A paper describes a structure:
Photosystem II (PSII) produces dioxygen by extracting electrons and protons from water, which takes place at the oxygen-evolving complex (OEC), an oxo-bridged Mn4CaO5 cluster with a shape that resembles a distorted chair. In conjunction with the oxidation of the OEC, protons are released in a 1:0:1:2 stoichiometry for the S0–S1, S1–S2, S2–S3 and S3–(S4)–S0 transitions, and two water molecules are split to produce a dioxygen in the S3–(S4)–S0 transition, after which the OEC returns to its most reduced S0 state. Here we use pump-probe serial femtosecond crystallography to reveal the structural dynamics of PSII from nanoseconds to milliseconds after illumination with one flash (1F) or two flashes (2F). We identify structural changes associated with electron transfer, proton release and water delivery at various regions, including QA–QB, YZ, the OEC and the O1, O4 and Cl-1 channels.
By Δt1 = 200 µs, all difference densities vanish at the YZ area, indicating the restoration of all residues and water, and the YZ–D1-H190 distance returns to 2.53 Å. The trajectories of the YZ area at Δt1 = 1 µs and Δt1 = 30 µs correspond to the re-reduction and re-protonation of YZ• to YZ, which completes by Δt1 = 200 µs, consistent with the 55–85-µs half-life of YZ•+ re-reduction by the OEC in the S1–S2 transition. By Δt1 = 200 µs, the difference densities in the YZ area vanish completely, whereas those surrounding Mn4 and Ca increase, and the Mn4–Ca distance further extends to 4.10 Å. The results suggest that Mn4(III) of the OEC donates one electron to YZ• at Δt1 = 1 µs to Δt1 = 200 µs. At the completion of Mn4 oxidation by Δt1 = 200 µs, a negative difference density emerges on O5, suggesting its instability, which is subsequently stabilized at Δt1 = 5 ms. Disorder of W16 initiates at Δt1 = 20 ns, increases progressively, and reaches a maximum at Δt1 = 200 μs. In addition, when the difference densities in the O4 channel are strongest at Δt1 = 200 μs, the main chains of D1-R334-N335-A336 showed slight shifts towards the OEC. As the reduction of YZ• is completed and the OEC is oxidized to OEC+ at Δt1 = 200 μs, the difference densities near Cl-1 increase again. At Δt1 = 30–200 μs, a negative difference density arises on W53′, which is located in the cavity surrounded by OEC-O1, D1-E189, D1-E329, D1-H332 and D1-D342, indicating that W53′ becomes further disordered.
Residue numbers in the entry:
A (entry chain F): 12 to 45
B (entry chain D): 11 to 352
C (entry chain E): 4 to 84
D (entry chain A): 11 to 344
E (entry chain V): 1 to 137
F (entry chain C): 23 to 473
Write the structure that this text describes.
Amino acid sequence: SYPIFTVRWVAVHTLAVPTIFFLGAIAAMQFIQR
Amino acid sequence: ERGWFDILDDWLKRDRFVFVGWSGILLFPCAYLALGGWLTGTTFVTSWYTHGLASSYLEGCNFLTVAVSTPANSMGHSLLLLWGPEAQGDFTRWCQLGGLWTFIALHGAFGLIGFMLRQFEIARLVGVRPYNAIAFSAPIAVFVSVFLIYPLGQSSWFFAPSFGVAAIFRFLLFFQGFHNWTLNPFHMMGVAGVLGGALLCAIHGATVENTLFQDGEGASTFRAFNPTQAEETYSMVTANRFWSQIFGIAFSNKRWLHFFMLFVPVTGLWMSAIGVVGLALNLRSYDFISQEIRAAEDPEFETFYTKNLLLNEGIRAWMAPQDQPHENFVFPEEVLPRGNAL
Amino acid sequence: TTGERPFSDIITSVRYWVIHSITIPALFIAGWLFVSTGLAYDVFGTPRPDSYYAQEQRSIPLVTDRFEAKQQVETFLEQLK
Amino acid sequence: ANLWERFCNWVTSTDNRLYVGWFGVIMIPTLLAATICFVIAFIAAPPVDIDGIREPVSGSLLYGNNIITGAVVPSSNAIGLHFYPIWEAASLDEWLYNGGPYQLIIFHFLLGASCYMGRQWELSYRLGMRPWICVAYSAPLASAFAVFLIYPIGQGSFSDGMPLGISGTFNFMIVFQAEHNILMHPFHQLGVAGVFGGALFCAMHGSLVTSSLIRETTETESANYGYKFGQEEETYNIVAAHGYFGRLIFQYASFNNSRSLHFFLAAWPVVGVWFAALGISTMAFNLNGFNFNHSVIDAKGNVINTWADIINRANLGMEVMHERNAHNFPLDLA
Amino acid sequence: AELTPEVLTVPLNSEGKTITLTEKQYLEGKRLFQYACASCHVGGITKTNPSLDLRTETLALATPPRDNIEGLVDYMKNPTTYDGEQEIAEVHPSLRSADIFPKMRNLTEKDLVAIAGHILVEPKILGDKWGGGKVYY
Amino acid sequence: ATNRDQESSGFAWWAGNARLINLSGKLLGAHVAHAGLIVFWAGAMTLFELAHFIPEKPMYEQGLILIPHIATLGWGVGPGGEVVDTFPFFVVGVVHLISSAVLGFGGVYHAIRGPETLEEYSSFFGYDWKDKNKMTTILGFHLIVLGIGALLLVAKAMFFGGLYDTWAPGGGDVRVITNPTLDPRVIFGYLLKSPFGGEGWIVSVNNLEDVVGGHIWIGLICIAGGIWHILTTPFGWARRAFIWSGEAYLSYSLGALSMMGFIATCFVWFNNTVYPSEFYGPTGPEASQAQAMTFLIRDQKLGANVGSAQGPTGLGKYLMRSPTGEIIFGGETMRFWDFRGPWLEPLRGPNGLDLNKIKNDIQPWQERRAAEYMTHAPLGSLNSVGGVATEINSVNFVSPRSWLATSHFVLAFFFLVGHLWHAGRARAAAAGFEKGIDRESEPVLSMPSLD
Ligand code: CLA
Ligand code: CLA
Ligand code: CLA
Ligand code: CLA
Ligand code: CLA
Ligand code: HEC
Ligand SMILES: CC1=C(/C=C/C(C)=C/C=C/C(C)=C/C=C/C=C(C)/C=C/C=C(C)/C=C/C2=C(C)CCCC2(C)C)C(C)(C)CCC1
Ligand SMILES: CC1=C(/C=C/C(C)=C/C=C/C(C)=C/C=C/C=C(C)/C=C/C=C(C)/C=C/C2=C(C)CCCC2(C)C)C(C)(C)CCC1
Ligand SMILES: CC1=C(/C=C/C(C)=C/C=C/C(C)=C/C=C/C=C(C)/C=C/C=C(C)/C=C/C2=C(C)CCCC2(C)C)C(C)(C)CCC1
Ligand SMILES: [Cl-]
């Protein structure tokens, strides 16, 4: 009935995809010691 | 004529979840890159070589202390293009030299242009007057005067605000110590517009909510409203009588009321921008000459004006060596201004 | 409505969660490794805790020239022994 | 119709040009007292020894001030939190030297303004209104209590209350930053979101309604004549406004219920300013903003400065210079 | 820059013998200094008497000298005025006065060495910041 | 689902607890379940504090607010406030934690299992908000319970070990209170003191005899008034002055709690008798005076004549006069001369600070106490960096007095807002226009115009 790949789909993922990657990078930072 | 231009126009203006428009060609890349540059820089990029500061989560800063900091003072007002003669195409060097700052500021400037074109573009399609775009000129005037004109008047981009929470707080305190910016009547008018706008927001929202007509039976009054109803949902006559008797005067024209709500904060922001244009040139409201002549000659004359200058002198001497590392200020302990004991 | 599928429809669909029970953790782990391998330091030029200063120096490696700034940073980076 | 019932019906009458009411019976004399003393003191009061060190500060116009530098100066630090009415002084000249007027103005003003809030409740009751306009006014009212009463109590002296003047206000803000790092306190940050957001939503609401006014006038006349006081029908098209703003962002980010829209306009600045008042009120008991001074340390243990440490340098300059003759011992503990 | 054995090597006594601390001792010295001493000595100053700091140069000219482990460990058992003339256990925390300074009750001899090592190493890291006060913050 | 949606009840989900107003049986459940939450936190928090407690560190260095409350009552402490036995802290925690299960059980039962209304089931436990006789009877029962509670403190003080007395000769100790103050001129004279500096209203109570005797008076008054309100019904003047409804009754209590929260804020900030500084840390006034004392002692040891040392302003560097002549500490702490504390009063003579006592009688324990309090001033950041705002990281400290005063000011403020909200709504609902103006009956349309 509905399409899968729309403009809204692109807009959602250009934000959501880097967000998750960054959250994993920042989670890893909490275990860095000087 | 249904050529490729008109077919493209058709596609750009489809009613979708996120409207695009012709303005979206400018708005979406520039807004996305400015935001992505700020998140990239605050997460991973240092300010060690430009400021002597750590400024990223990678280095151990938190949400309050991360920033994308301005370039080094030695860059002057360089565009700092990635392919320019300073970075020479080297992405890592570009990051270390402060290229993300001009990147965010310039893509942000064009992003803001694109958002205001979007307001115009949608308004013209829907058939409403473009007053939302007109009101948005005030955020643009603030952004352009603080982030572009101000450093362009100074020695370099270094003295522009850095993009971070605590970095902006430093910007506030620099403006007090060096510019005496609280004393500036253009700032005062801006404060009036912002606080007056918050006042009007609170009081109009509260007044509507407490002069509602009983248009339903539930104790939750929200449901008793229909977007297409013709009647006013609250009593302008009762509201007018309440405020006339409480405060002396009251709105009686609902069109004037809502234009005024537009006018007050928009005008305030515009006034503050003019004052910052002056500070670009150090054209400050720093002193009252009459007070200084009296105080120089009469060591018993003291006002809150003279008290605040002593505070500004403390700010300048105590923050300048760290805040302006390229100047190489060495201030021995004995020259630092200090009161008794402290 | 504008024709796209409702979000509440999508995120309660088994097929959405079959796909994103993989793609979400995969991206998270990719972000973690970007830091844990030390790659983030080298992409962006950010000091590690042991590379802000040389062992006995206490001066900042501050860039002071416009057109030789790239060479100045490279010189500062050599002097880390 | 006895004389007490006559008086009560006049006090509570909805026909007075300005409503009096029972709260107004306290409001009117206290506000008049505070207003008259303030105007006289602002023009002609002699210098005041605010910090108790026999170092009087001149606040009035006749003693060398303009509108920007003038103030009614807070009462002497030697008095602390002691009550200092006129009859506790040996003379008016003593009372003036010690900042007597400040106490008289703020106590009458805080009473009058609290009654102003009650008066807002009271008239809404007499007119058959819903009662919560006074709850919105509690946000600015709480803020006045914070800088004139609560902060003196926690610091132990009305001499650290906010001065009644323009440059005096700035002095208060700068010393507050030095002693509490208020910029780094989340309640002040919520306060800034309250008033920045309040100003944004103000211009937002005004621009959207103005953008969708229904054509009722010609171009040579003000569109304001297209609305008539008391008319039954709405004067703008909220559906067209929602249709514009929904497409500016996305549809579900836009209100189409005018009642909840207006509730949001009320709540955002009021809640924000409540947090601001609570910031001042809790820093009154020295629970201060976040301290990240020297939080970032390298492998050897060198301090790596952040923007927080630069803020600290500015705060130190304010700290060491404020009240420059008032401290004999190395810690400024109040 | 790194916390190296060179940094962690400090004078053991007045005769020029050195001892090299471990990173664990240094870090333990820091934690115990915060526990028992920093309320008055944060940053190497002395809040209740700012004329006397914990800079190594100041400790060298104390009587007896306190710029070494043994001098500092002796100070924490039986502190004196700067000229050695008077014993101040009654007003300064020490093992001798652990009854009235209860935080000293659970310090062992090995703890005193670690605290001492922290006081001697920190100036080698911080330079003028140690004992310098607010001017160097 | 009786009254469990917006259509049946008229209240949306975000005001869902308003659906309980006329469902006494479910309303009982909510109240009992909630009291269980209160008792749970008290029990659990005590245990957490105990697990994290090092007896050799002062309580105030360890983030403790509950153990200080227990120690003040005489349990677990001896001379000078030293902890001699942590077992009473354990007991108080365990018993509160165990009891919360009983209350949680009853609350959950009445909330979801028992009768939704109590009027059909029992006319003793049933009530109508508008029944002025029943409401004052329930009020009367709870006044008797409160009065018993105040007498339990008297019983602890007079018969079950006593109370911690910061003022006890010899440094502070648990002391049995044998002669509580009963003279009503003393007890009620506290109520007529000015709340301003040097007076301090009831916050100024400074001895355990007054504290215990005040609770004897409060106990009887509550029991008497509780009996009074069981046997009587509101008089005509009272009937005409109040709104008689559930929401109205709530609003009066919200006003009362707000007032008490503000009073508690000041109590913990100024009072060092029922909030001993040994347990809570020095007050702000206390620490500021202690700094003046510390440097007077230091400089006098170096040979300064502190009585005649003129400071830069012309006022004494160490000593000066208050506006009424008393000899007081100088510098900015001049504002704090109303402070009284056991470590300072031995230096006090009829005229204030006595220069002869200062020159000759300062004992080492006073120097120790002033240095400790000066360095534990109640100043600190939100992330618990102790000291002035410009201090560096090192000391993990925020005074219990700051935690307790800031939290209770915030709570008292919001409870004042809640009083205004619910009192204004109660008035409007009783009069019938809390949902909006009737279009066909708009009151302003029937009034003469203002001009
Ligand atoms: C202290 C907080 C508190 C308490 C005691 C209550 C109590 C109540 N609420 Mg309210 N409510 C609250 C907060 C609270 N609420 C909040 C924060 C909101 C906003 C979300 C609401 C919004 C709300 C609405 C919209 C409604 C209520 C209703 C009710 C009543 C019936 C609930 C029911 O039937 O659920 C049935 C739920 C279940 C059967 C699920 C489990 C419930 C149990 C009790 C969980 C207990 C678990 C516990 C760990 C077990 C311990 C047992 C052990 C001691 C042996 C009940 C008296 C209803 C009402 O008024 O009815 C007339 C109602 O419609 N509440
Ligand atoms: C003893 C105190 C008390 C009691 C019994 C009530 C009872 C009631 N209130 Mg009142 N109220 C109170 C105090 C109280 N209130 C206070 C102190 C305020 C000022 C803030 C209010 C302001 C208020 C308003 C504005 C309204 C009510 C309403 C009501 C009715 C519906 C309540 C409901 O279902 O909320 C449901 C509960 C929720 C939706 C949850 C709220 C979540 C809060 C904001 C979180 C707070 C943050 C937390 C403290 C810390 C962060 C937690 C996080 C990190 C997890 C009910 C009769 C409603 C009414 O008028 O009905 C007649 C209503 O509109 N109250
Ligand atoms: C009377 C209330 C009160 C007070 C004065 C204290 C005080 C303290 N607690 Mg305790 N505690 C409390 C309640 C309280 N707590 C509650 C309810 C819990 C269960 C959650 C705890 C569980 C607890 C633990 C597990 C610990 C403490 C600890 C501490 C100490 C350090 C606190 C800290 O660093 O805060 C950090 C500051 C914050 C988190 C700021 C909170 C900001 C809130 C969210 C704002 C809320 C505003 C308002 C209520 C909402 C209004 C909304 C509006 C729309 C109306 C300090 C002595 C620590 C300690 O040292 O133990 C020995 C510790 O480990 N407490
Ligand atoms: C103030 C709180 C309170 C109130 C007013 C009520 C009231 C009621 N309960 Mg509920 N209930 C409560 C708390 C409360 N309960 C608690 C804490 C529990 C768990 C123990 C229960 C579990 C419960 C069950 C399982 C049942 C009830 C029932 C009832 C109804 C009949 C009670 C009766 O006639 O007993 C007669 C009176 C007594 C037997 C005297 C008991 C004396 C107690 C146990 C000794 C302690 C007294 C002393 C004051 C306690 C101090 C406590 C304090 C320290 C906190 C009545 C409406 C019944 C019901 O709903 O029927 C349909 C029913 O079946 N209750
Ligand atoms: C929680 C406790 C509580 C509550 C809610 C009530 C509630 C009530 N009482 Mg009861 N009463 C109580 C405890 C309580 N009482 C106790 C402990 C006793 C024994 C002393 C009494 C003895 C008593 C008598 C003899 C009478 C009542 C009456 C009443 C009713 C009228 C109340 C009224 O008009 O007050 C309003 C308060 C006033 C009118 C006082 C004068 C107003 C002054 C100027 C206000 C000053 C405020 C100021 C800020 C004070 C600050 C502190 C101050 C002390 C310095 C009301 C139902 C009346 C009634 O109808 O009985 C059936 C009545 O005649 N009560
Ligand atoms: C305040 C209550 C203090 C605490 C806690 C600690 N110290 Fe201290 N220290 C304090 C004072 C007032 C003085 C001067 C004493 C005098 O009159 O001479 C000192 C001195 C020292 C010194 C000597 C410094 C020098 O000679 O230059 C040292 C080495 C010292 N203190 C160490 C020390 C340690 C290790 C502590 C924790 C166990 C400690 N101090 C706590 C005040 C206070
Ligand atoms: C720069 C650059 C670029 C770009 C890049 C980009 C575009 C990026 C993006 C990026 C991104 C896009 C990122 C993101 C991130 C995100 C994040 C990091 C988030 C986080 C979040 C959080 C953390 C949250 C929190 C919260 C809040 C806020 C509130 C609510 C609640 C909570 C708590 C949840 C390029 C390549 C072109 C070129 C070069 C340069
Ligand atoms: C109604 C309702 C509600 C509420 C509820 C509630 C509120 C409840 C409560 C509850 C409770 C309140 C509960 C409690 C419980 C408890 C318990 C269960 C306990 C136990 C204990 C124990 C087991 C102990 C143990 C121990 C010991 C003994 C010793 C020491 C150690 C330890 C700790 C281990 C809600 C909101 C959800 C909603 C719906 C409705
Ligand atoms: C314990 C103690 C004590 C004592 C105490 C006491 C004895 C108390 C009392 C108390 C009291 C005894 C109080 C009272 C209060 C009261 C009140 C708070 C009131 C109020 C009122 C009102 C609120 C009213 C209102 C109104 C009006 C005015 C008009 C008409 C209407 C109405 C009714 C609304 C002492 C200090 C010794 C010491 C410590 C401990
Ligand atoms: Cl001082």
